[PDB]
Amino acid sequence: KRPYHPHLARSLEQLKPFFVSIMLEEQNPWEDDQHAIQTLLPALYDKQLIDSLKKYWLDNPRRSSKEKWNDIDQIATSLFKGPKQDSHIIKLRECKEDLVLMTLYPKLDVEVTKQTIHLLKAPFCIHPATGNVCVPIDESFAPEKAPKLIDLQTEMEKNNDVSLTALQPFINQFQAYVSSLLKNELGSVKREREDDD
Amino acid sequence: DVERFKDTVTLELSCPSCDKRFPFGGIVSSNYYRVSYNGLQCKHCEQLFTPLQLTSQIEHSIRAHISLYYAGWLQCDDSTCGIVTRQVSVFGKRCLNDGCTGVMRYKYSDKQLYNQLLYFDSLFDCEKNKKQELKPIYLPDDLDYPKEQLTESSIKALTEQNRELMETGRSVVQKYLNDC
Amino acid sequence: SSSEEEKKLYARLYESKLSFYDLPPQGEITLEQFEIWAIDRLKILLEIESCLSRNKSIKEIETIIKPQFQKLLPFNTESLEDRKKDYYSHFILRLCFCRSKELREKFVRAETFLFKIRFNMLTSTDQTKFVQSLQFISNEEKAELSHQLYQTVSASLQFQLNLNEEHQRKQYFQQEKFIKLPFENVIELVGNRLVFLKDGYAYLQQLNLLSNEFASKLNQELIKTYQYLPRLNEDDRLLPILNHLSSGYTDEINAQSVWSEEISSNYPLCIKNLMEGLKKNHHLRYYGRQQLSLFLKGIGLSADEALKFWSEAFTRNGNMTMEKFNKEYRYSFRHNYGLEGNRINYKPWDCHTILSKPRPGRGDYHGCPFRDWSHERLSAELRSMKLTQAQIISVLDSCQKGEYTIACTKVFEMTHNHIAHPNLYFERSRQLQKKQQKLEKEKLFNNGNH
Amino acid sequence: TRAGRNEYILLHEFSRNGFIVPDKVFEPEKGLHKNYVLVMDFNSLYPSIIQEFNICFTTVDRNKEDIDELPSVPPSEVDQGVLPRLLANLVDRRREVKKVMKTETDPHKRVQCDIRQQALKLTANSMYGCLGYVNSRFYAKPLAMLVTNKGREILMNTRQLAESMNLLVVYGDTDSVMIDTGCDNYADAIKIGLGFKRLVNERYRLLEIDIDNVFKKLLLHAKKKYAALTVNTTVLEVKGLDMKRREFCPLSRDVSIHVLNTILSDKDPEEALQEVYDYLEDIRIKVETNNIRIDKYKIN
Amino acid sequence: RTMRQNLQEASDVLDDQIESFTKIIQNHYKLSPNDFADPTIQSQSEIYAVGRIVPDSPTYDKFLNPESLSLETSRMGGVGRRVRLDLSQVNELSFFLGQIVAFKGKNANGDYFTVNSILPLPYPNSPVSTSQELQEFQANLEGSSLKVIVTCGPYFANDNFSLELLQEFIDSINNEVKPHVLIMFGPFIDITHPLIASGKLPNFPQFKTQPKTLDELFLKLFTPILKTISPHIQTVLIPSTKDAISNHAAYPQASLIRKALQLPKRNFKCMANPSSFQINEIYFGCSNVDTFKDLKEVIKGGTTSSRYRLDRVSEHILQQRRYYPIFPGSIRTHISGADLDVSYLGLTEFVGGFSPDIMIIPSELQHFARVVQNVVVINPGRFIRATGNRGSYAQITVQCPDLEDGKLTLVEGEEPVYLHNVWKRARVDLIAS
Numbered sequence A: 001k002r003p004y005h006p007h008l009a010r011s012l013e014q015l016k017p018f019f020v021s022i023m024l025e026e027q028n029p030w031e032d033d034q035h036a037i038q039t040l041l042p043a044l045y046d047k048q049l050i051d052s053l054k055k056y057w058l059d060n061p062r063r064s065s066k067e068k069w070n071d072i073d074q075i076a077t078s079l080f081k082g083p084k085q086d087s088h089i090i091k092l093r094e095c096k097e098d099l100v101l102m103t104l105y106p107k108l109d110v111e112v113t114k115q116t117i118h119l120l121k122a123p124f125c126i127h128p129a130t131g132n133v134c135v136p137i138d139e140s141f142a143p144e145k146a147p148k149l150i151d152l153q154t155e156m157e158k159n160n161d162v163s164l165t166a167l168q169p170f171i172n173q174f175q176a177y178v179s180s181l182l183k184n185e186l187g188s189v190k191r192e193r194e195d196d197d
Numbered sequence B: 001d002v003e004r005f006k007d008t009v010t011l012e013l014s015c016p017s018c019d020k021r022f023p024f025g026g027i028v029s030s031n032y033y034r035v036s037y038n039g040l041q042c043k044h045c046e047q048l049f050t051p052l053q054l055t056s057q058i059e060h061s062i063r064a065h066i067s068l069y070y071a072g073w074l075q076c077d078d079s080t081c082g083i084v085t086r087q088v089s090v091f092g093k094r095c096l097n098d099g100c101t102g103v104m105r106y107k108y109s110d111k112q113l114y115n116q117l118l119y120f121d122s123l124f125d126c127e128k129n130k131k132q133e134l135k136p137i138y139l140p141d142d143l144d145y146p147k148e149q150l151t152e153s154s155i156k157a158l159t160e161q162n163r164e165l166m167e168t169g170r171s172v173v174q175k176y177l178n179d180c
Numbered sequence C: 001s002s003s004e005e006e007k008k009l010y011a012r013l014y015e016s017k018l019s020f021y022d023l024p025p026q027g028e029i030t031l032e033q034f035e036i037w038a039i040d041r042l043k044i045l046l047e048i049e050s051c052l053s054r055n056k057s058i059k060e061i062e063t064i065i066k067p068q069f070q071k072l073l074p075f076n077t078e079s080l081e082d083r084k085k086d087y088y089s090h091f092i093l094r095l096c097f098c099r100s101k102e103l104r105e106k107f108v109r110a111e112t113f114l115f116k117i118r119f120n121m122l123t124s125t126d127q128t129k130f131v132q133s134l135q136f137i138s139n140e141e142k143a144e145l146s147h148q149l150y151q152t153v154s155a156s157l158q159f160q161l162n163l164n165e166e167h168q169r170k171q172y173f174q175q176e177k178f179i180k181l182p183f184e185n186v187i188e189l190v191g192n193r194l195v196f197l198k199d200g201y202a203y204l205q206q207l208n209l210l211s212n213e214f215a216s217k218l219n220q221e222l223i224k225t226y227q228y229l230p231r232l233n234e235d236d237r238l239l240p241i242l243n244h245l246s247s248g249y250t251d252e253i254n255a256q257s258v259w260s261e262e263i264s265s266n267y268p269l270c271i272k273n274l275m276e277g278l279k280k281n282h283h284l285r286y287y288g289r290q291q292l293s294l295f296l297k298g299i300g301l302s303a304d305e306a307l308k309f310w311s312e313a314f315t316r317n318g319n320m321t322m323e324k325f326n327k328e329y330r331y332s333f334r335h336n337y338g339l340e341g342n343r344i345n346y347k348p349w350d351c352h353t354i355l356s357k358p359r360p361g362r363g364d365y366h367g368c369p370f371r372d373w374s375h376e377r378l379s380a381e382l383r384s385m386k387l388t389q390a391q392i393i394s395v396l397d398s399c400q401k402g403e404y405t406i407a408c409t410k411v412f413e414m415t416h417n418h419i420a421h422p423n424l425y426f427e428r429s430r431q432l433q434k435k436q437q438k439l440e441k442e443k444l445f446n447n448g449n450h
Numbered sequence D: 001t002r003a004g005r006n007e008y009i010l011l012h013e014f015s016r017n018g019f020i021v022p023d024k025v026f027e028p029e030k031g032l033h034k035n036y037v038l039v040m041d042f043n044s045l046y047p048s049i050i051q052e053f054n055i056c057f058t059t060v061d062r063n064k065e066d067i068d069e070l071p072s073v074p075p076s077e078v079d080q081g082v083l084p085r086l087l088a089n090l091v092d093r094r095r096e097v098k099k100v101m102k103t104e105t106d107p108h109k110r111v112q113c114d115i116r117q118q119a120l121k122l123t124a125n126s127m128y129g130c131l132g133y134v135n136s137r138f139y140a141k142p143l144a145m146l147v148t149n150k151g152r153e154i155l156m157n158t159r160q161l162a163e164s165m166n167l168l169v170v171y172g173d174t175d176s177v178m179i180d181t182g183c184d185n186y187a188d189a190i191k192i193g194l195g196f197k198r199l200v201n202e203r204y205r206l207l208e209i210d211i212d213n214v215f216k217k218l219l220l221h222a223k224k225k226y227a228a229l230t231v232n233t234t235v236l237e238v239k240g241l242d243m244k245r246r247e248f249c250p251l252s253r254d255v256s257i258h259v260l261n262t263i264l265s266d267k268d269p270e271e272a273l274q275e276v277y278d279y280l281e282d283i284r285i286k287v288e289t290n291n292i293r294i295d296k297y298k299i300n
Numbered sequence E: 001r002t003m004r005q006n007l008q009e010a011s012d013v014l015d016d017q018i019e020s021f022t023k024i025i026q027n028h029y030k031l032s033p034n035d036f037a038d039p040t041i042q043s044q045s046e047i048y049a050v051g052r053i054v055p056d057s058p059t060y061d062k063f064l065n066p067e068s069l070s071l072e073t074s075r076m077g078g079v080g081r082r083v084r085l086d087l088s089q090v091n092e093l094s095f096f097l098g099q100i101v102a103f104k105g106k107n108a109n110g111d112y113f114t115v116n117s118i119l120p121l122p123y124p125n126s127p128v129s130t131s132q133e134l135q136e137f138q139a140n141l142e143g144s145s146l147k148v149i150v151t152c153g154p155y156f157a158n159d160n161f162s163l164e165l166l167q168e169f170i171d172s173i174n175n176e177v178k179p180h181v182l183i184m185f186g187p188f189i190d191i192t193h194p195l196i197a198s199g200k201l202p203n204f205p206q207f208k209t210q211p212k213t214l215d216e217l218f219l220k221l222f223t224p225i226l227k228t229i230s231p232h233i234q235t236v237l238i239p240s241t242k243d244a245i246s247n248h249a250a251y252p253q254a255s256l257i258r259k260a261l262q263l264p265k266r267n268f269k270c271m272a273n274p275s276s277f278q279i280n281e282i283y284f285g286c287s288n289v290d291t292f293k294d295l296k297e298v299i300k301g302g303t304t305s306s307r308y309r310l311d312r313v314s315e316h317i318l319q320q321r322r323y324y325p326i327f328p329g330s331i332r333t334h335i336s337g338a339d340l341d342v343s344y345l346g347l348t349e350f351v352g353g354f355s356p357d358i359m360i361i362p363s364e365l366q367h368f369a370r371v372v373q374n375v376v377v378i379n380p381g382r383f384i385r386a387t388g389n390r391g392s393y394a395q396i397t398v399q400c401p402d403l404e405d406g407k408l409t410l411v412e413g414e415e416p417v418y419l420h421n422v423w424k425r426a427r428v429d430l431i432a433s
């Protein structure tokens, strides 16, 4: 829907600097011509532009994602001429922004949030297939940083104390979060008491 | 309005000069009275009614009805008892006949008296006079059904000519209609 | 209270042309005023309900209701009497509809829609005065958040107020005021991304939230009025009017032509049922005879033709002699026409009085088919009227809700292209038939000159 | 009166549990109802309300300074009070008595069990007088108002349920509700009444209402002012319409009784009415010709 | 208040009459409520009972007798049941319909209540005043006596509209009598006046513009004439239910609107019917329904029959603590009547339970002024007779209060108050108009 809601526009601005660096180079999913036809072309609005890009990429196979991204604009400029060119340019920009959101915006699991009675896995639980601890996440977190239970056992064999294992930083982070939550809960109780008087 | 006044009684005037009595049905055809361009006129002796001679009778009829209403007659619902009385038991709705299960009701209910006062008011409603929605004071089989029927244009012009008299007569009734 | 003090209080209350009906009216009104104002507001609400059940657009409903406003409940007038009429009518209808949950829901829905329409017909300055009369944000806070607020509200402006030009939208936004409230109260607007959110507060579409608060307050006040009603039950004077208002929500014509197809296409289904019963059995019981006789009188059948009609219908099977008909039935048929007894001209039965009937048993043909017939049988005749399955389903859905008059209007509309009276149905059908005949005659005349 | 039994049982129970005891409507639809009309007994409304909502002296927090203030029913966490516990005990003992009755063969013991069940029912239905009666030793205005409001709610939802079954409430109060079944056969009317009973019990688990009277016909004017043809074998029964028989001669009473018999007979309402007219005209001819015994003209 | 009559509310008032009189009797005779029982049911112990006098049959002959009366019991006393009276054992009594009575009796066989003795309702307490107020009144009068004139309608005869006698009376009071206060009862323009009734109202040559309504007839016929009353004479206007100028035709009757009559504020006061008010210390009780003509007694005994009727009627009015105790209301057959609004019979009771010092109940009967139970009862008669001959009016002259002369009686108590003795101090003259 246009115009974007301020949340949608803000998310688009936050995601725009990362779109190139992730999709067009690091992942490069549209280098494959079939993958391009399957995922990049359907996000465009004009059938003539889609057909022209399809023919161009068939004649020039295996253009990388950045090259195809520039080809979209080049062929659209070549096709859409006259007083109506501005509307076509705006629509192409809108489609490109829609693809940026489609590719980078959060894709939540909608069931778990809807109802108060829904159950969700507790933190620090062990994933049965990988053995990773469901540790809390900071800004530097990566999946390879999650401690494994067998590694924690190996550490505990040398040092029979949880405080000397790789699980400890996450425990400290969770403890700090809990302390802040309790402080805010006390503040909210005080505010409610003040409001009632 | 047709069903509202089906049970009310007619407004009876007495001629100041010749003493002839006749119902007053508004500005309508009648053998006994004529509303002329210059006021109400009795047809028996051609003499004119002046506001006071009309409004005094209107007020007298209204106050007679109010006195009768305050007389406090009660009637029994039960069709096999049907007594009419002014005694009121400390249980109001109870019938005073031994063992009677009928519901006593004021014979002259305030609904009936409000309808009567509204009929009186409609008699001197000029707009109601023009469109001719007043309740008839004669049945077709009545010996006094009028021989001549007034026309619509005559009614309009005559009501316009007599606006002041009709408004004063209406104010006489409204004196009690605002109090009811 | 002195008349002057009463006027002062009423003016303090109407500082705006629109109200939440927060404080009870004070003063005395006559019974005629009570009933007339109640019936007028009830007619307005019933027309609102009929428009809504037909899925009419808001603009169409407004256009239909404006003349009804000018006639029954004048709004945007400076007269104290019209404002008194609105306030007292609203509180009388509160007394009427507080009895049952379904009545409460219908009343609050209709009243909220009426509120919406009235707010829409107000001027922007009057709307601002009413909303000022729920904390508004300061001009500084509006300036800081101006870009986000304009982005949020531009689409709403374009689609609701038809401000297609961007300059007009910006000019309106500069004058528009915003209300800061928690998003939990406007979650409905949050879902469609119509309101701007910041730090748990929603910045306001104001009409929707105002209507929601009005509906909630009205529901609560109806509940309180229902709790306090038994104390009012001691007033013998108001109870019949309240009961009636609550239930109110629920020689061309002669003895021979009334049987003809030309006249037979126009009756409502109740009348067709009564006539079919009369033809089959050559007899109708008391309530059916009364309903049919009053309808026939209301459609133009004179007394003599009514006597001929009834005698011919009753003596057709030979089971009734003319002597018995004159001994037992002639008096009643003449009485229905006001020729006997107190000469009371009985009015034909509307839908409500028919429904107040005591339910038809075996051998009875009176009442309303949409209430008294089984779903299969109704589907049978509605198929016989060449109605599609979807139309039949809609009519049966209306019947299931207890909106029998709505289904009557529906079958009228599908068979011909709000009715609450059999004579009204007959009259509308007759007018449409005459219009169609005139159009056909004009077409024939036009096709004869080429 | 009932006052002695109510107050006495209450004080006994309270003294036994370590408690200190205190010191000493829907307007009738008048007219003839052709369809079967059932009288449905609602006597157990108040005891079932007290039991279901745990209303008691010890459970309902009430403002004892202002007795007119309406209190709220206790939350489900509150343990069962003494009053609802006694009501439940009475109901359970009645159920035990009926279970024993179903198996019992000896007529003597069966009659004894029936008397026991009737006494238990009477006490359970009279228990409300403890807290409703104004001059009761255990009077409590807030509790009486609470129970009365709940009864009003239950009666209105009973109307709504009856309308959901396409039934018409002819008349109703806290004690009885009369429903128009819309049928003209005994089996159909009883089935409709049992279905309505099942629905009411489904919506109110502790409310068990039952059919008290079966009216094939009903000319109704008030709760206790009506005539009907009751089924037990149909029989004519009149209530409140035989007040003044002395003022009327035996001929008038015979005419009235015959007219009632004919109108309420199982004949079509037109042939029966023509029979009434034939009877009336024949009576007029015999009166005008004086061919009736002079005894029928006597008035005492 | 509008013109509404509710059977339940009227029945509530009629019940409250019996209950209040029961409590008054129990207080006066120091009797416990257990001593009072239901007289409509058989009991073989003698019981106390309070109720209302009613005919034993609801459709009764115009004339009653001592063998055709019943007692109507209150809702609590006897569930509203009515019991026949057996008065063979009572030799002296006087009853009327609507009187509230107290009986000591016995209902033995179920169908008759035998009265063994009567329990006369006590006479209400008289008003009292402090020393300071009496000295202020002494200063007010400047030594001289208090003069108050009372007149009653009709004011003009049946065959004309002349108020020449009224003008003569006004000149007399202005220049010779010079009273302090003048009380005028209605009717002013009686609506039962046959010329008003029949519409025979002629043109008036002395009016520039003819009246169009009876209200304008009053404004043009009476108000000029009343305006000539000296401003030093405060005058009181009390309506009757037959007054055409009133839009409240029910007793109790709301006071006239002085502005509507165009009467100046300086000395014109409009009071309700009935009304109770003080002039200096003197308590006035004024009612404009002819209780004296209407109250028809049933009587046994030579002693009571040998008494004057007027004293008996005045004692009945005092005992019933209400100016019009008859019920049902009297009727004039329909032409006019009492026009009782039963729902508001509370307003016609003695204000505060005090018995007025002078009670004025105008009657069509001959003028009279009498002292009954230390209360002066005045009937000044009609100002003008039907034929136009001189009627009558009453002059009340009361000696100025004096604590030292002894005619005021001191009431014992910590706070000293003094009983007005008007019957000792008032002279009442009935003067031909």
Ligand code: SF4
Binding pocket: C268, C269, C270, C271, C350, C351, C354, C367, C368, C369, C370, C404, C405, C408, C420, C421, C422, C425
């Ligand atoms: S809705 Fe009314 S007009 Fe239509 S069939 Fe039913 S009763 Fe007749």
